[PDB]
Design a protein around this ligand. Sequence first.
Ligand SMILES: [Mg+2]
Ligand SMILES: [Mg+2]
Ligand SMILES: [Mg+2]
Ligand SMILES: [Mg+2]
Ligand SMILES: [Mg+2]
Ligand SMILES: [Mg+2]
Ligand SMILES: [Mg+2]
Ligand SMILES: [Mg+2]
Ligand SMILES: [Mg+2]
Lengths: 176, 188, 134, 133, 126, 37, 23
Amino acid sequence: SRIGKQPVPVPSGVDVTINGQNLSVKGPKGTLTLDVAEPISVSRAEDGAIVVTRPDDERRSRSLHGLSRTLIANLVTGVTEGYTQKMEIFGVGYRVQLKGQNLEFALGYSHPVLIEAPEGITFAVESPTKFSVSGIDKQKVGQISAVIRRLRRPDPYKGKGVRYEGEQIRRKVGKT
Amino acid sequence: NIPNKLTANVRTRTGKGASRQARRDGKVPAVLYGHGTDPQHLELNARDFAAVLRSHGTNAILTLDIEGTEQLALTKALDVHPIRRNIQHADLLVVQRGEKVTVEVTVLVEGDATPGTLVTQDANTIEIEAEALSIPEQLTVSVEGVEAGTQITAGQISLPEGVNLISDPELLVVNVVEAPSAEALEEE
Amino acid sequence: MLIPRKVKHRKQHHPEQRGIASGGTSVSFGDYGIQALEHAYITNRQIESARIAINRHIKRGGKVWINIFPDRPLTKKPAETRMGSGKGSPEWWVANVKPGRVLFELSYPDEKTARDALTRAIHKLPIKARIVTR
Amino acid sequence: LIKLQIQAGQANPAPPVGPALGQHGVNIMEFCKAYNAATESQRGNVIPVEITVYEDRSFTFALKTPPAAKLLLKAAGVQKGSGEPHKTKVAKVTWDQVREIAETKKADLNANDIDAAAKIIAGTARSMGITVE
Amino acid sequence: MAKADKATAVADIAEQFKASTATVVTEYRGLTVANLAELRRALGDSATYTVAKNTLVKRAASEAGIEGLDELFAGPTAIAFVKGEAVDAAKAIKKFAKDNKALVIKGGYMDGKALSVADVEKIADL
Amino acid sequence: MKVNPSVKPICDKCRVIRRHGRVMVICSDPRHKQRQG
Amino acid sequence: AKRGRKKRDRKHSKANHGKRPNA
RNA sequence: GCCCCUAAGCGUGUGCUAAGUGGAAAAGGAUGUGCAGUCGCGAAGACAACCAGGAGGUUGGCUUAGAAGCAGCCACCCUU
RNA sequence: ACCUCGAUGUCGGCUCGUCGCAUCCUGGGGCUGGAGCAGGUCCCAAGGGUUGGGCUGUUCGCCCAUUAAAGCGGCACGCG
Ligand SMILES: [Mg+2]
Ligand SMILES: [Mg+2]
Ligand SMILES: [Mg+2]
Ligand SMILES: [Mg+2]
Ligand SMILES: [Mg+2]
Ligand SMILES: [Mg+2]
Ligand SMILES: [Mg+2]
Ligand SMILES: [Mg+2]
Ligand SMILES: [Mg+2]
């Protein structure tokens, strides 16, 4: 409600096309599409911004309003600037490298693991223990980041494993 | 100390059935036997009646408008319910604007005794007599710096002007006793 | 545990549990009382358990009142003999409780502490109850 | 940074300040040497210190005021105080001694005048369980 | 906390505003314990760090001729009063603000008249 | 993960939420993570 | 006990009026 | 009883249900939802969040080798 | 004592199997006062396996060798 009532400020270098329920956006980083909910009406105001409205105040509409608003906001943000998630590797002997378009990690396993980058998402490495993943779809970026994080078992004794940029994991101590 | 106005209409039918119907219709049966007059069976509104009772209740004076015939009255009984809390019947007494009636007023303890003590209120209401319009809605008893083993009785209650205590002055109303310990609590 | 010193009759007829409570409905001694909503027998064991729970939740403060005393005995067969013989002997004492009858009361200053103690006590009873104030 | 209380005629106290300061990687030898050289003038009253550690592991201890509790205890004459406030006394205290300790401690209390210092010290004393005539 | 505590609080607000001369508008949540104690010990020579409530400042603004503070209390605000000279207190406050970049300055009150950010910045030098 | 018919917040930060046709408790402390079953 | 429970529950039918034989 | 089996309404008007509840059940647990009565605050800008704290006395005393605001017991205060 | 005294043959062992998971192992996961191996608790999971002997009619139980294990029960305390 409080979020669904606000407009969506569209930058200059963006092309928004609404057709019924579907809505496509084109920008420098790429293009995206979305299908807003049925009980909500999306419209482009005279100032270019987008506005979503609800014909009723039921629970369904109140929950879908802000949902669709933030969805289109993230869509425009991604097609304008894109999303990026930095990670970090901790633990002696734990390393990561770039092999073409895929990432090869060695986290103490007997064999090195490989993660291939799907469409609309790329990887980058700034150090053998510092890398990041960039893309347009925030959902896909978060999914790939979570996959890369869960690749290794969470170890709170030594913190060995994958971690996000500003991750704060809990740590215990084994006195024996 | 001003009277609370309220409307009231005579009951066109008595009995448990009519009473249950009135209670379902958000009404409250009431009697107005008065101070020696023919009794009248009226129907008050539960909503505003409970509102007035929560505002200044406990034998609050009232002013019934029985078909435009304004008349003072005083509630001298309240049987709400054993389990739930609903006003199922009222008994109002005419005061005649000047009678001296005797009614029980609730007492309330205020203050803080010695930290190593505990206060117990044995009597909640006290038989008080005063003018119909000057009925105190509550009485106050202060407990400051009181030591253990102290018995504040009814006679020690400060009464406003024109107010008298009908009950004996020896009725123990408040008792401050040394705070029981774990042994005293477990040996009971 | 509570138990009468001596009863005129040792064996009774399973005291009936019906209707609403006529007396003991309003709080008189304590400040916060527990009022039951279902008719059922309360045993001296349950009474002692609730009293111990209250006395443990409240340390060196307040006072507790028990407005019910278990005096109605309930017999019990040997649990292995056949049906039909002299009526069994009493084994546990109960207290006929009806909806609307105040069972326990507390005079603790801390309102929240008293409410928590009364809730923990009710949690040890075989019926539903609610906290009321003087 | 931490404020630790310690006696004057002592040296190398392990319980009070041992692990409270050694864990920070501070040198204890010269610290205790300077503390003794500074407290050798009084040598007759417990004196705390608000150790303020620096980034380069250096330190400049700021000699604070004695504790109000121990000041009141030594003014009353007894060494062990009461356990119940306003329920057990130890001895009597003199207004002259109270004013002396207040004048010596004025450089630590938030008070502005000797009257406010006396008020604060009397509040501390009555919270501890002692009163001055 | 308690209504009596808040009443005594407002009483002290009045009893210290009658003594203070200059004041500025900032925020009070300075920083961690160590550096906050250092800042308090540094500004203790002429000022004292403190905080209060919106209702407290609202009920206290009725004593002196600062009734105009209603529009400022229309939304949050933190104050900072000075006891001694102000030409140095304002300088120190501006220094701390520019050093921390988290304590914003919005103005002050002197001579029973409100002053703007530019006005206070210009008069602090003199 | 404690699976008990009765779940309630133990800590102050512990929150209660409604997962798929059931109640659940969550928190940063993995000990207070319980489910209703 | 499932059989007796089902019987005593079906007893509470709108066609029997909460009354049936053998409980 | 009136959707087919199976004879009769996939009846009319006003509301509820997301669990197939309907189409089993107890103590308790629970930001599910609709109605209605109260109480705190609130354009004198309410709650959360963008961004930032909690002092001196003092480490209140007994207890502890120890309790510095966070095994516990007593009170539970003065100043800035 | 509600069918069964003008008959329902009662405990074992052998053969023969079927089904439930309140799971002994294999499989997956959460918390651990989980450093690692090795454990404690819980949740899901019945596809498969779940040894051979001495005592004693025995069921049960003890002991000897192993194995991952040598599961709990219903089927007229399964099966004449
Ligand atoms: Mg048909
Ligand atoms: Mg149910
Ligand atoms: Mg035959
Ligand atoms: Mg035959
Ligand atoms: Mg299972
Ligand atoms: Mg298969
Ligand atoms: Mg054999
Ligand atoms: Mg079998
Ligand atoms: Mg057989």
